[PDB]
Ligand binder design. Structure first.
Ligand SMILES: C=CC[N+](C)(C)c1ccc(CCC(=O)CCc2ccc([N+](C)(C)CC=C)cc2)cc1
Ligand SMILES: C=CC[N+](C)(C)c1ccc(CCC(=O)CCc2ccc([N+](C)(C)CC=C)cc2)cc1
Lengths: 540, 540
């Protein structure tokens, strides 16, 4: 018996599986329960730690995906199906995975913890693009990844109530962080060197753990890829969260007329519905037509978040913290085919001026007409106010800057100014195997496959340069996880990655070429969103 | 005796004078009266034509400069005193000048009519920089220039009342245009080919005549240099004009204590005051501290202008009209030493961030703080928001765009779209003899000396290339006067000057290097001034 694949934790024993890589094996422990199944009366409730078990839990395959909406916009299309659940759906989904090098480290080893994105309504740790075998083999860190409840099961909130407090999906992540503290040593991992990293809604989750004291003591570095907690999509107010929860209850027959509708009876009725019935109405509760807006997201209750993320970032002391942040080149192009008029993944999407003006109200919903006019002023090329190709890039910039690029830059500058050491990047390589149309450029989410070393998979058709490029990125991420600085420790030959400051605002472009330093994360555009537009909305 | 210096016109006989140029003599008739002296009871009234005289009026020297404020900011300085009056001040100032080639043309010759600027409060046709001997000698055109009343004597208005109708200085200009119609043939000039050209407030004046039906039938082409009638400084409302005229009257003791307030006594009391007393209180009636704002300007009365210039430009059909418009590279730098904090012509004017924010309220007076916030957003480089040099040029752009470059580009686009053939230029040569500091670049008003061929004066220190350059511009301006087209018209190797259209927005740069087409007269900045900022003021 290979004792490598046999490990004991505080709950009991596990058997793992050995994974092959072109350069050696890794030990994987997939599907470890870290919480009691949040079913029945535990729906919408904070997680309870998994009770200890007799025997040996089989940890050889990924467990079930949490109940979530399944994208059907393009059936059979790799670009969308690669994010859909690849396991059976179940509310019994609170399991985590641990990768560790072979042979198991006799040293303590820094631990990377992955939090998947998906707009807080979708995502799973079992997706092939989150496969940690290549990262662990190449850089010999310990990689953990958890499943957390999404959609209504994770973020439905009747604020101020005990039956559905909200943010329980964030607590699921926190519970897996505490599990890493108490058990990662048994896998050769150093619980004093824990680096969180996530993408999209995962990056917002990482940022919200930076701003939550109870979670703050469970990690020491943080990486936020194409996401931030301060953005306009990542949180929601109590009153609007209550309206959406009530809207979902009404759509599924809760409460049954004409019985009372206080918070206890409302959640009690919600707990009797099959989980799929709730999923089938999740998008019906969004107030207006939009892109980059989701129904059940973290709520600002005063509990998990003392105040708004924006407030906590401003009043926050971040000394002793090192953060890696960044975005992709075209953060907004992916979302345009999900509601922007005139857009289609199967043509050039050379939109008209009327479609551009119509899309601005969908990409920037919930704003006054004067605010929309300011957006149109800032993003119109007035020497070419109706060139379709430029209108397409402009709306992509509108959605991208408003939702990702500027909230990130807002966070990056406020962190470096208030004590934190910050590194910033912009991912500019478009995968040679990318299936989305070329007018999308480098879309949201398509740096992940290079961070996780997927090109090293011999069954895939990446090029030789992309494999070398994937090794550079895993080195950057591992160097940062080990030292807090992505630069190679004793290497002066390598082009160096300067920190990001509030004044210089230096970042690097990541692609096949060597590192290239630039300054300003779209400084002129983000000044409009971060500085002027709030003044335009308050003076109304 | 040379008989070509003796010419008879409708009012009587004249003796002129012969002026020398390096390439041949020119016949000049300086000081022809075209109106009765607007003195005594005729102060503030429209001009009356000059009654016929017996004998020979001497026309060998310039007549008196109209009463006006005299700049004292920098005594002894060539940069300011080149614009100050060079003849005695008098209300008896309605005289015009005619230059004509030697020998006098035998066939009708195109006429250029100059209208000096000076914020409607200053200026004279006798200034050395307006000497027409070189333009008339080099291009054998006929040049006329007139004096018109400035300040209160030309533009004090009690709207509605008959004793201070307002715009009498524009009627002075109109009367000089009727004189050119009735008499320029006696000098060899073609009254069917007359081209107006003015600078600053003269360019605005030229625009007002384009929009005035009684004046429109007196010319066929227009050149507007660094000015337009639609700008924020060239016109004033009726209610504001009444308040400025009433405050001036109070500042000089009108009316006497306890006597009535009706408009006849007000003007009657104003007519008893010495002209210098009215001049000494001119800058005291303005509302706020500001640059590029003047007390007595054309009033929108319903008479000379049936509506505002901005409205008349939109509604008018300009088919059959050719327009030459343009600007200098640094339109706003001159005005900063006249009120912007931290500025001085004798240092580098490296202002601070606080001084930039203060200067914006002086450069854009009486706008909302929200409007000023948008101004600062647009002209701050947020990667270098406090570099003193960038703040200096940014404030120069603020004053230049708001007052000159964007009203001109707006007029140029509307003229071309609505039937007129338009040519646009940017003057980018800084005179080698310029006495203003180097940080001012190419200031307001310093293309005039090259248009008028001043470098050809042997008693100056211009370089050889500047003389060649001045001949190119005189050829440009003269070709446009003859043909309505600044091109040769045939070389065709000479680099051509394409018309300005509302779409392509093509203009050329005028300097020592050959002509060069560019696109967009500050397209992005003028979209903020022309398109966005109005909607911001409407929402308040
Ligand atoms: C690609 C990124 C990968 N990761 C990071 C996981 C990722 C990040 C972010 C997202 C959200 C994408 C959307 O905002 C579509 C939202 C949307 C979906 C469906 C609908 N219907 C209306 C139901 C369909 C009709 C059109 C409307 C809106 C997905 C995946
Ligand atoms: C240079 C161009 C030549 N031309 C075209 C004739 C020309 C065009 C435009 C102007 C206006 C210049 C000003 O706006 C000074 C305005 C000003 C003057 C005096 C004052 N005090 C308060 C009295 C002095 C204190 C500062 C304030 C403001 C001048 C000349």
């Amino acid at each position: 018996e290979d004792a490598e694949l046999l490990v004991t934790v505080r709950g009991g024993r596990l058997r793992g599986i050995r994974l092959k890589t072109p350069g050696g094996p890794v030990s994987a422990f997939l599907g470890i329960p870290f919480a009691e199944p949040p079913m029945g009366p535990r729906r919408f409730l904070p997680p309870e730690p998994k009770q200890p078990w007799s025997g040996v839990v089989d940890a050889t395959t990924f467990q079930s995906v949490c109940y979530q909406y399944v994208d059907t916009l393009y059936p059979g299309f790799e670009g969308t199906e690669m994010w859909n659940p690849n396991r059976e759906l179940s509310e019994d989904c609170l399991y985590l995975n641990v990768w560790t090098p072979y042979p198991r480290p006799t040293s303590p080893t820094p631990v990377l913890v992955w939090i998947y994105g998906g707009g807080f309504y979708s995502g799973a740790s079992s997706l092939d693009v989150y496969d940690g075998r290549f990262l662990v083999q190449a850089e010999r860190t310990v990689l953990v990844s958890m499943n957390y409840r999404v959609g209504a099961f994770g973020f439905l909130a009747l604020p101020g109530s005990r039956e559905a407090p909200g943010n329980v999906g964030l607590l699921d992540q926190r519970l897996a962080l505490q599990w890493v503290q108490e058990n990662v040593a048994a896998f050769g991992g150093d619980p004093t060197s824990v680096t969180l990293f996530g993408e999209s809604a995962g990056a917002a989750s990482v940022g919200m753990h930076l701003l939550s004291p109870p979670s703050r003591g469970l990690f020491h570095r943080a990486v936020l890829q194409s996401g931030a907690p301060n953005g306009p999509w990542a949180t929601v107010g109590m009153g609007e969260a209550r309206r959406r929860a009530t809207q979902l209850a009404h759509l599924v027959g809760c409460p049954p007329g004409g019985t009372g509708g206080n918070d206890t009876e409302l959640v009690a009725c919600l707990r009797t519905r099959p989980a799929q019935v709730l999923v089938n109405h999740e998008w019906h509760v969004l107030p207006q037509e939009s892109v980059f807006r989701f129904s059940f997201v973290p709520v600002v209750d005063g509990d998990f978040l003392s105040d708004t993320p924006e407030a906590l970032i401003n009043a926050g002391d971040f000394h002793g913290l090192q953060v890696l942040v960044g975005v992709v080149k075209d953060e907004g192009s992916y979302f345009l085919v999900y509601g922007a008029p005139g857009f289609s993944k199967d043509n050039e999407s050379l939109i008209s001026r009327a479609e551009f003006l119509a899309g601005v109200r969908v990409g920037v919903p919930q704003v006054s007409d004067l605010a929309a006019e300011a957006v149109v002023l800032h993003y119109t090329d007035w020497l070419h106010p109706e060139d379709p190709a430029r209108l397409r890039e402009a709306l992509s910039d509108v959605v991208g800057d408003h939702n990702v690029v500027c909230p990130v830059a807002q966070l990056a500058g406020r962190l470096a100014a208030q004590g934190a050491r910050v590194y910033a990047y912009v991912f500019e390589h478009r995968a040679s195997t990318l299936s989305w149309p070329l007018w999308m450029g480098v879309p949201h989410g398509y740096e992940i496959e290079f961070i996780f070393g997927i090109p090293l998979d011999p069954s895939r058709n990446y090029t030789a340069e992309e494999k070398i490029f994937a090794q550079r990125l895993m080195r950057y991420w591992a160097n940062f996880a080990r030292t807090g600085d992505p630069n190679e420790p004793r290497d002066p030959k390598a082009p160096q990655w300067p920190p990001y400051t509030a004044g210089a605002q230096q970042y690097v472009s990541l692609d096949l070429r060597p590192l290239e330093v630039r300054r300003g994360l779209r400084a002129q555009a983000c000044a409009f969103w971060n500085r002027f537009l709030p003044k335009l909305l308050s003076a109304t």
